[PDB]
Amino acid sequence: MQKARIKIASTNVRSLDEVANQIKQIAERTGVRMSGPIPLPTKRIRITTRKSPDGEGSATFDRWELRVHKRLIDIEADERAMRQIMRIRVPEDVTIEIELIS
Template sequence: MPTKARIRLWSSNIDSLNFVVNQIRNMAQKTGIQVSGPIPLPTTRMEVPVMRLPHGEGKKKWEHWEMKVHKRIIDIAADERVMRQLMRVRVPDDVYIEIELI
């Protein structure tokens, strides 16, 4: 039987991500479950250079669009009561969550 649950969260909006992480930590602390984390993982930075003039005449001017993806990992004890409460946590649309029993 699994004894821990590993929760992976990622988002391009750091404020929404921290809001969900704080909700999970507060919920686990209220129930008295041991919490490990949040462990911040390296931020993935994706950059796309796009030429401003599509026809290519004149000076080559580039725009750089970038998106940063922030990631966190939280390990909590896999108690049935806590897992049910975890499913009720409101997660914004721009935050992605993955739960794995280890």
């Protein structure tokens, strides 16, 4: 066997949790021991911008959020038990990284 890390991030809240939940449900029952889906930070990205193209009078200034959230999953299964679980549909728009070590 081979301890795999699924490191899964997404740009929006609804898309990331459904995959994290589904990954912990399908893997649960087979030849997998699975450590729980741990939430790491939101590296919230602030873009802080000038609205007005005149830059004139008072110019009201847009605050921007890009929030990118990262769930992490350790798993003890084969490379074949890994693809079976990576079958799932996945939101657009959800990055799934795989490191493989023994």
